[PDB]
Amino acid sequence: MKYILVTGGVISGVGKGVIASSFGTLLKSCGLDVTSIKIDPYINIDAGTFSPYEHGEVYVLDDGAEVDLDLGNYERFLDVTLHRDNNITTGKIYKLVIEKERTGEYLGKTVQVVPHITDAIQEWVERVAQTPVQGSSKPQVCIVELGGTIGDIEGMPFVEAFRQFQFRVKRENFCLAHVSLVPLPKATGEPKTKPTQSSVRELRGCGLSPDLIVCRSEKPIGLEVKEKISNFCHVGPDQVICIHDLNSIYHVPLLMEQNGVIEYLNERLQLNIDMSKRTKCLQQWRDLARRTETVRREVCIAVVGKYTKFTDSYASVVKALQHAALAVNRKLELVFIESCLLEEETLHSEPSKYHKEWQKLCDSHGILVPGGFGSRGMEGKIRACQWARENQKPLLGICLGLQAAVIEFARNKLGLKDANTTEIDPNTANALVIDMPEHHTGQLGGTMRLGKRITVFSDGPSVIRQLYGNPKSVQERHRHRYEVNPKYVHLLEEQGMRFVGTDVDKTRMEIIELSGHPYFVATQYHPEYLSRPLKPSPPFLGLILASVDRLNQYIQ
Amino acid sequence: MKYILVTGGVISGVGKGVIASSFGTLLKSCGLDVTSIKIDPYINIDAGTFSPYEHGEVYVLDDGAEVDLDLGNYERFLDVTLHRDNNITTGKIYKLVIEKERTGEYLGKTVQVVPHITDAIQEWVERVAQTPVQGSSKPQVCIVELGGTIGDIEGMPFVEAFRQFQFRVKRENFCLAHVSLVPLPKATGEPKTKPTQSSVRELRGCGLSPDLIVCRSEKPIGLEVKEKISNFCHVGPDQVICIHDLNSIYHVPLLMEQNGVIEYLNERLQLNIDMSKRTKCLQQWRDLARRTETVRREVCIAVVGKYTKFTDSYASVVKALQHAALAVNRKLELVFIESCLLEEETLHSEPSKYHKEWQKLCDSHGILVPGGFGSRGMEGKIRACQWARENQKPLLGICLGLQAAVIEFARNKLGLKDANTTEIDPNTANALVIDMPEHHTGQLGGTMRLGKRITVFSDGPSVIRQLYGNPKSVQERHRHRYEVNPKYVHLLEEQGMRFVGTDVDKTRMEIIELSGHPYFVATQYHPEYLSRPLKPSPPFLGLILASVDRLNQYIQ
Amino acid sequence: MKYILVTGGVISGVGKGVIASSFGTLLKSCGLDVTSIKIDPYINIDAGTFSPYEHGEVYVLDDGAEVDLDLGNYERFLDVTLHRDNNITTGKIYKLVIEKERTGEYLGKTVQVVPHITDAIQEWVERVAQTPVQGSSKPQVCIVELGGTIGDIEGMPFVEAFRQFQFRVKRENFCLAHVSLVPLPKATGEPKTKPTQSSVRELRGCGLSPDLIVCRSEKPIGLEVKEKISNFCHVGPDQVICIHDLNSIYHVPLLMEQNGVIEYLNERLQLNIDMSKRTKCLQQWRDLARRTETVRREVCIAVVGKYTKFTDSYASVVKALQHAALAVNRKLELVFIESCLLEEETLHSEPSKYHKEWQKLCDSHGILVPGGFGSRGMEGKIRACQWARENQKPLLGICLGLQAAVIEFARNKLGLKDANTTEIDPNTANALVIDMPEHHTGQLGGTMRLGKRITVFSDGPSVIRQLYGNPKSVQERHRHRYEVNPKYVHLLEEQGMRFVGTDVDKTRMEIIELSGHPYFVATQYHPEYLSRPLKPSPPFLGLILASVDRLNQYIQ
């Protein structure tokens, strides 16, 4: 088992995740099995506490784990399926060790950070690196990405663990890549290597020695800066890799392959890649990165979102839209519309922003209501679903656009003008959405539907069955708690709201599709968790093909 | 509230505990209320897992907590009663924070070491420093002793916490004392200040600045070494305190008062001691420290102990014996006798060590069987209790010498030759000791008798009632699980084994005293937890007064 | 004597010189006597070895010292006269100590870096801080600017010296200001305080504690960044000073006075400024900084310079031009014309750049030939002087434009077509410029005319006498070696080349002024060494007033 550790230098927002993912993509293209581990030095255990407006985009693995979005980035770039243990945190390690000590399996000894916490870290890393992530074959390389910057208090147990680890796994199996900031004060316009010198000094002091240096700057750095860095950091000048700000993120593995990273890793980790097939063709990645700078025709999509700030709060959604638009060969223009600026309460307060938001929503080609874990701004979501329903505008709803869609449908098409949720307003005669928790053996009470579940379609006349390649079932990822009530599902089925897919027991409803409309569908699950750069997801594919009037042509 | 933080320098075994305790003793003598906090950077939560041969001498507070022996040292030197929270560890802090995060009282934020763990440490320290330890009056100074050496990974959260803390409590209320090693290579016989320079550099880097430097050497250091240290560490030359190896530990507060520490603390922390009464007489401490170097007549006591190694494995016991001997005005010579080297199995293996151990046990004036948390070597304890019973040699048993004494009494005086425990050999018709756990409301099951409990004596003719000042009750500290069976307690009461004291409900037995013997008593509790330098404990007092034939004279 | 030390943080080009000069300007305006010391950690002793294309603009003090240009910046901003010892370097200190040791005035002891080099540094600093720089009154504050970044090997003796020094001069007389880089990666657009945290940690470790933090960013930083910095660096949030990129350098003292630096220094150094007169009016500095952003009408000046690169290679010249243009109330547009691109050798090689350079020289309003210490490109200087002479374009020559002007005058007006220098081509019958070195008692041989010398004018009809306020003499600064030959000075005086000023002995010639021309003058000295922001120098004043046809109007 070979390891590649990716550490960070001067500051935090220095670009470690894209470097690690690109390493993975290169090695994958060369024919290797690659897993990856992300280490977060914060005290949390999961993302089930994280507020959406505070961190954004809980990513859900197919075993039901709510983890960092960085594991989502690895899943997209490497095309693998990671588990909950592929994400180590400080809280997880300290909890495992404190519990082990409290049930007396250290045999009365004093448990200390060194060596017990570092032994725990090393055993965890060695353990989850042999777990298969692509089928059943063992991985051959593991990319470990360490969060934070060297010198911080929070990351010291981990660098101590990895010093000992580099000697435990026989250094010919261990490579370290250091990502640092080469700043450039515009008072003189010269790249400064002094912060990199300091950070590599701290790294050497802690016991680790870099094999690659990845510099982060805005344009390329010359050979003099490269030679100064290789002199102070003890690498070769070819092992100093410059990654400037490129067009897209899909150009970073190509820029890494242009700097000859594959040959250095093939000799340093003693892999035995046969460097003959075009040097392990990254051919379709080249096609995709070329399309990213070629598309011209625009498609405008609206995103009715509560936390309009985009500190990665709709990351998987935006990326599913991008992967869909690139395969449709069109440029994506994304509009973010606050959902609370759509209710006429703002009209009562000040009509200016109300009107401009409504005009931005009106001049769009398609609508996407994402799933906010909450009820704040749901009124705007109902208004937007209604507007799109009575204007023949294509719409896709995600885990809450289903609830909002069925609510507005009942309200303004079946006369149940008091239909609402039990999310809020739990005092309602017409509870259109109810709470049907999961009851699996091993539960006392009930919890969400979490993870990969099977879904079976109903009948013939539906487009979602076509976009999915006409299969009988489809496995997707669920993170919901509330459903719709079957009384009403057969009430509002005579009126135009067909239910196309649901579980094997037919007790819940997952995909609605109101007929007599170009594209009006909704899903309880999240389709943006299985969207990859080289294979988009069929719901977003259809939403893009409909918003530019290419859907029917694509069906045939 | 004023604080004094005591940190450590070059190595670990540098003498921090005695420095902190002596600070406390000085300030106490000057008329102040002093509490103290001990910080252990290890991952454990309590000492209930610690093996006795691994750390030695679990100390039991009077609320039932099993803590470090350093809290025992503070209790002896300061004459206070500390609680479980006066002993912070890394495990306690990380467990409190992980639990707070897992029940969502950080409100969805990311919990990080800085600032959340350091905020937790600061709030804990501020909290337990206002808890009264002497009656009900609030403390005025708090001595915080930080374990480990500056620069270690385990102690970084704590020094970060205390940097922020020094600014939160208004520096005129915060003083730091740094204890360092001044080594002396005998190749040249000159004290070296260079390691102190390095450690104070690391301390300054982490954000703290010393107010006192306490050097640790074998003989005094001159004024040139003192001036070099004050030059590199930014203190005055009078704030460099030399503590060499003295006669006893009772000379350290006197040596601190000779270096004018009280005046510096009175001006630096702005206490308002009225330095007139002999400068706050340490008079009876002077008497005790003088007696330590004056006593001449010897008394030899045997300690039948399993783990003959004395890495502080019988600390409170040995110190109770010392406090008893000093008030009796005699020198104490302590013999450690392995309990497993008394059973004739070693006689079968090799009789040499068997015979020499038995001769050491035979030429002693008194026997003390301590309480080992286990059953290893109990056979030797039975043999020793029997030998002392049939030779009129004074004996005191502690929490297991009671069980061993009653076992040998039954065996070799009432014919129940198969009497044993349920500790080991749970298959016995004659279970002399049984398991009567505590059942207090708030329990599901049963746990030990732990902490301070009341004890009432039975009748008139007993010496233990006399040594205790003839009170009706006495509060002591229990850490036992097994008792004796009442059937047998009234069986072997006609034969000479009187039961003098027990609980209020008379369902257990605590003090046995077999009459027709100079001094043969036993106790279920531990009397060595309430033994102080200036007031010994009556059981050990009587054991010393009997082993030198001064008991009857002392009674009158 | 009060001290202010200015140190540097993360990188080198962080802006220390302007911060130190602005401190000086503020304190000067408040009515204090201020001196300043610059510490360069390089091994050189003077700038007499520095190549002009390598460092640029040797500045000449009025005692004959060739020093850094930073002393020129202090002289301009503070309006003082510094000496050679106001510029400490590593070479100076180590040479003084090595020589002291080699002549046995350490009395046989071992001389070590600590304490002997640091004692030398401290005595030097204490010594030159009491030397008067403005008349004869003792200074009251001293600004010490330490070059380089904390953590470098070259600057460790100096920070050790200043730790000891802060305690030697009684901390109430010592203040430290730390200038650091707050970088801003545009991937997220958030200012990062982590490098400042690291550098202040190193600074604290070395023994110094900041009193002010001066952050360097492109736009202002908020109160959250300010609070994070004050938390980690132990200052108040008002002592965190943000200096963004402003219009000019004359806005930095005003931005410092807006952040209340004067009040903090008045309380911290216990100066006794009476903060009543507008809080010590920086009134004419306000006028000048306002004019910097108000001037509209343009004036274009050409600079025929060898090393067209401007790494501060014509700093004093460009600044004299700016100070002149601002008082004339016009905007200055400066053109840099390579002197070697004017000889027709480039015409033979490629005429494109030749022609474009000649067109840039042709479309200018005035010409300035600066003094290059050499002979490279002098041919272009002769061509430019000739072009300006036969086109009635105003010209000013500086220490080599005098030689070039007299050479072209002889050549193309008196028929001596082989007139040249002994600088190059030492084989010439018509040596128009000769070498007349200085012979002062205390010399074996000859050296340059270096430092402040007196100059007496000749007669009535001249404009340079008018621009100087019609004085009899003027003290200027000389750094030349070659002069003109008196035979020829009376040869080409009938032809239109009048000599207006020279020494007291009339053996050399300093100011030529060819009549029958708007403004054609030349000077052997450098007038750009006495040019101040609030009083320009008369030669450049006249050159600007002539290039915009305002000279004659200004004369009356």
Ligand SMILES: Nc1ccn([C@@H]2O[C@H](COP(=O)(O)OP(=O)(O)OP(=O)(O)O)[C@@H](O)[C@H]2O)c(=O)n1
């Ligand atoms: N394979 C990846 C990796 C990165 N990202 C996105 O690109 C942005 C920048 O990535 P990253 O390198 O992780 O930036 P930072 O997290 O700010 O830098 P660091 O990890 O060093 O803290 C992130 O929002 C991430 O969602 C992505 O699209 N796909």
Ligand SMILES: Nc1ccn([C@@H]2O[C@H](COP(=O)(O)OP(=O)(O)OP(=O)(O)O)[C@@H](O)[C@H]2O)c(=O)n1
């Ligand atoms: N470990 C080091 C490295 C360099 N220097 C000093 O730093 C100075 C160079 O300044 P700087 O430009 O900041 O260093 P660079 O190596 O050039 O780094 P940068 O890329 O930021 O320019 C030199 O005088 C050198 O003596 C030092 O003292 N200690």
Ligand SMILES: Nc1ccn([C@@H]2O[C@H](COP(=O)(O)OP(=O)(O)OP(=O)(O)O)[C@@H](O)[C@H]2O)c(=O)n1
């Ligand atoms: N008030 C005190 C403090 C110390 N001791 C005893 O003296 C010995 C040495 O004390 P200490 O200073 O704590 O030594 P170390 O623990 O080895 O040093 P450190 O705390 O720095 O690790 C210990 O066994 C302790 O039991 C004591 O009798 N009474």
Ligand SMILES: Nc1ccn([C@@H]2O[C@H](COP(=O)(O)OP(=O)(O)OP(=O)(O)O)[C@@H](O)[C@H]2O)c(=O)n1
């Ligand atoms: N921060 C310091 C302190 C001292 N020195 C050097 O260390 C040498 C002194 O050696 P040493 O005896 O080890 O230092 P001392 O201060 O005397 O420490 P010690 O008490 O161990 O003798 C001197 O040459 C001095 O230049 C140094 O380089 N850096």
Ligand SMILES: Nc1ccn([C@@H]2O[C@H](COP(=O)(O)OP(=O)(O)OP(=O)(O)O)[C@@H](O)[C@H]2O)c(=O)n1
């Ligand atoms: N009072 C001053 C100070 C600075 N300068 C000029 O402004 C430029 C930047 O000044 P400085 O702060 O010294 O920049 P650096 O030298 O690059 O930064 P540092 O001193 O920290 O190395 C320099 O070219 C200098 O000539 C100026 O005009 N007048």
Ligand SMILES: Nc1ccn([C@@H]2O[C@H](COP(=O)(O)OP(=O)(O)OP(=O)(O)O)[C@@H](O)[C@H]2O)c(=O)n1
């Ligand atoms: N001395 C310190 C300071 C901070 N942290 C950790 O650093 C993380 C914060 O990351 P970063 O953003 O890089 O630190 P900031 O203080 O916010 O610095 P910056 O201004 O660059 O954002 C937190 O988890 C905190 O636990 C640490 O380990 N050691």
Ligand SMILES: [Mg+2]
């Ligand atoms: Mg990242």
Ligand SMILES: [Mg+2]
């Ligand atoms: Mg440099």
Ligand SMILES: [Mg+2]
């Ligand atoms: Mg100790």
Ligand SMILES: [Mg+2]
């Ligand atoms: Mg020495």
Ligand SMILES: [Mg+2]
């Ligand atoms: Mg500078």
Ligand SMILES: [Mg+2]
């Ligand atoms: Mg941050």
